[PDB]
Short mmCIF file of C-alpha atoms in Angstrom, two decimals:
data_model
loop_
_atom_site.label_atom_id
_atom_site.label_comp_id
_atom_site.label_asym_id
_atom_site.label_seq_id
_atom_site.Cartn_x
_atom_site.Cartn_y
_atom_site.Cartn_z
CA UNK A 1 18.78 -55.64 7.96
CA UNK A 2 20.41 -55.76 4.53
CA UNK A 3 16.93 -54.95 3.23
CA UNK A 4 16.87 -51.61 5.04
CA UNK A 5 20.39 -50.64 3.94
CA UNK A 6 19.49 -51.16 0.27
CA UNK A 7 16.72 -48.55 0.58
CA UNK A 8 19.31 -45.76 0.44
CA UNK A 9 18.99 -43.57 -2.64
CA UNK A 10 21.93 -42.18 -4.62
CA UNK A 11 22.46 -39.56 -1.91
CA UNK A 12 22.62 -42.16 0.88
CA UNK A 13 19.27 -41.19 2.38
CA UNK A 14 16.20 -43.38 2.92
CA UNK A 15 12.73 -42.11 2.02
CA UNK A 16 10.06 -43.02 4.56
CA UNK A 17 6.82 -44.19 2.96
CA UNK A 18 3.44 -45.26 4.31
CA UNK A 19 4.37 -48.84 3.45
CA UNK A 20 7.85 -48.93 4.94
CA UNK A 21 7.20 -46.76 8.00
CA UNK A 22 6.16 -49.61 10.32
CA UNK A 23 9.43 -51.44 9.59
CA UNK A 24 11.76 -48.45 9.60
CA UNK A 25 10.28 -47.10 12.83
CA UNK A 26 11.40 -50.24 14.66
CA UNK A 27 15.04 -49.42 13.96
CA UNK A 28 18.14 -51.45 13.18
CA UNK A 29 20.13 -52.87 16.11
CA UNK A 30 23.13 -50.69 16.91
CA UNK A 31 22.25 -47.93 14.43
CA UNK A 32 21.49 -44.28 15.02
CA UNK A 33 18.47 -43.06 13.07
CA UNK A 34 18.66 -39.48 11.79
CA UNK A 35 15.22 -38.33 10.66
CA UNK A 36 14.37 -35.18 8.73
CA UNK A 37 10.68 -34.35 8.94
CA UNK A 38 9.71 -31.98 6.18
CA UNK A 39 7.14 -30.75 3.67
CA UNK A 40 8.24 -30.33 0.05
CA UNK A 41 5.10 -29.45 -1.81
CA UNK A 42 2.65 -26.72 -1.01
CA UNK A 43 0.31 -27.02 1.96
CA UNK A 44 -3.48 -26.71 1.95
CA UNK A 45 -3.04 -22.95 1.53
CA UNK A 46 -0.70 -23.31 -1.44
CA UNK A 47 2.29 -22.12 0.58
CA UNK A 48 5.75 -23.67 0.48
CA UNK A 49 8.09 -24.22 3.44
CA UNK A 50 11.23 -22.23 2.64
CA UNK A 51 13.05 -23.38 5.78
CA UNK A 52 12.30 -26.99 4.82
CA UNK A 53 13.79 -26.47 1.37
CA UNK A 54 16.87 -24.63 2.61
CA UNK A 55 17.77 -27.06 5.36
CA UNK A 56 17.27 -30.08 3.13
CA UNK A 57 20.40 -29.00 1.24
CA UNK A 58 22.33 -28.61 4.50
CA UNK A 59 21.09 -32.03 5.56
CA UNK A 60 22.36 -33.70 2.40
CA UNK A 61 25.70 -31.85 2.45
CA UNK A 62 26.42 -33.08 5.96
CA UNK A 63 25.16 -36.60 5.21
CA UNK A 64 27.58 -36.75 2.27
CA UNK A 65 30.49 -35.70 4.49
CA UNK A 66 29.64 -38.29 7.13
CA UNK A 67 29.29 -41.10 4.57
CA UNK A 68 32.68 -40.23 3.07
CA UNK A 69 34.67 -39.45 6.21
CA UNK A 70 33.07 -41.86 8.68
CA UNK A 71 32.42 -45.05 6.71
CA UNK A 72 32.19 -47.30 9.79
CA UNK A 73 29.63 -45.12 11.55
CA UNK A 74 26.46 -47.03 12.36
CA UNK A 75 23.95 -44.44 11.19
CA UNK A 76 21.00 -44.27 8.83
CA UNK A 77 19.63 -41.03 7.38
CA UNK A 78 15.90 -40.76 6.63
CA UNK A 79 13.48 -38.17 5.30
CA UNK A 80 9.72 -38.11 5.68
CA UNK A 81 7.21 -35.71 4.14
CA UNK A 82 4.29 -34.94 6.45
CA UNK A 83 1.88 -34.99 3.49
CA UNK A 84 2.94 -38.52 2.54
CA UNK A 85 3.01 -40.56 5.76
CA UNK A 86 -0.03 -39.80 7.93
CA UNK A 87 0.65 -42.58 10.43
CA UNK A 88 4.02 -41.04 11.27
CA UNK A 89 2.39 -37.62 11.63
CA UNK A 90 -0.13 -39.15 14.03
CA UNK A 91 2.41 -41.24 15.95
CA UNK A 92 4.85 -38.37 16.47
CA UNK A 93 2.06 -35.88 17.19
CA UNK A 94 3.43 -33.47 14.58
CA UNK A 95 1.96 -29.97 14.43
CA UNK A 96 4.59 -28.19 12.35
CA UNK A 97 7.64 -28.57 10.11
CA UNK A 98 10.51 -28.96 9.73
CA UNK A 99 12.15 -31.09 12.42
CA UNK A 100 15.47 -32.88 12.60
CA UNK A 101 15.61 -35.61 15.23
CA UNK A 102 18.20 -38.24 16.04
CA UNK A 103 17.36 -41.53 17.72
CA UNK A 104 20.28 -43.32 19.31
CA UNK A 105 20.13 -47.10 19.00
CA UNK A 106 18.28 -48.80 21.82
CA UNK A 107 20.49 -50.56 24.33
CA UNK A 108 20.73 -54.24 23.40
CA UNK A 109 18.71 -55.28 26.45
CA UNK A 110 15.87 -52.89 25.55
CA UNK A 111 15.85 -53.45 21.77
CA UNK A 112 12.34 -54.90 21.52
CA UNK A 113 10.84 -51.68 22.89
CA UNK A 114 12.46 -49.37 20.33
CA UNK A 115 10.04 -47.31 18.25
CA UNK A 116 10.39 -43.84 16.77
CA UNK A 117 7.17 -42.84 18.51
CA UNK A 118 8.40 -43.70 22.03
CA UNK A 119 12.20 -43.74 22.06
CA UNK A 120 14.24 -40.77 23.36
CA UNK A 121 15.75 -38.52 20.70
CA UNK A 122 17.97 -35.51 20.27
CA UNK A 123 16.40 -32.62 18.40
CA UNK A 124 18.29 -30.06 16.34
CA UNK A 125 16.22 -26.87 16.44
CA UNK A 126 15.68 -25.41 12.98
CA UNK A 127 15.23 -21.70 12.35
CA UNK A 128 15.96 -19.45 9.39
CA UNK A 129 19.19 -18.32 11.06
CA UNK A 130 20.70 -21.83 10.96
CA UNK A 131 19.06 -23.21 7.81
CA UNK A 132 22.34 -23.10 5.87
CA UNK A 133 24.84 -23.64 8.68
CA UNK A 134 26.54 -26.89 7.70
CA UNK A 135 29.29 -26.37 10.27
CA UNK A 136 26.88 -26.25 13.20
CA UNK A 137 24.77 -29.16 11.98
CA UNK A 138 27.91 -31.20 11.32
CA UNK A 139 29.14 -30.45 14.83
CA UNK A 140 25.84 -31.65 16.30
CA UNK A 141 25.99 -34.97 14.48
CA UNK A 142 29.72 -35.37 15.13
CA UNK A 143 29.12 -35.13 18.87
CA UNK A 144 26.30 -37.66 18.78
CA UNK A 145 28.07 -40.10 16.45
CA UNK A 146 31.45 -39.62 18.17
CA UNK A 147 33.27 -38.75 14.96
CA UNK A 148 35.54 -36.02 13.65
CA UNK A 149 34.53 -34.50 10.33
CA UNK A 150 35.40 -31.55 8.13
CA UNK A 151 32.53 -30.06 6.15
CA UNK A 152 33.60 -27.92 3.17
CA UNK A 153 32.86 -24.30 4.08
CA UNK A 154 32.00 -21.14 2.20
CA UNK A 155 34.07 -19.30 4.78
CA UNK A 156 37.71 -20.36 5.15
#
């Protein structure tokens, strides 16, 4: 699993690719998998996803807080771009973006059946109103990961 951990970029997040998707989608025993499903470029109509762009910053801000304040937490953060990994789009039956989903680790006795495409997940609904709400997103992850964190806020 040391191979998967080394995939983290300088922000502590792992980019899903067509090549690595089959491996990553089978999980790491004991680890939560937080997956941001997004679209960074322009679509077929030359339009950009503003919500995708805005929440990606929120995503990274909260990931940074969790990495710093909860070093023991067994979690992995991932991003995937729907234009880059067609098998994931197919497997997860994606029809729109963005999505933020969290897979808990499979129970030890059910490990071999873990796959992103079939395993239960929590979803954090994304809308313009919460695109920049780091407090709320942090609270969501804190509850799932059973941690206590303090995200720096604009409002104090």
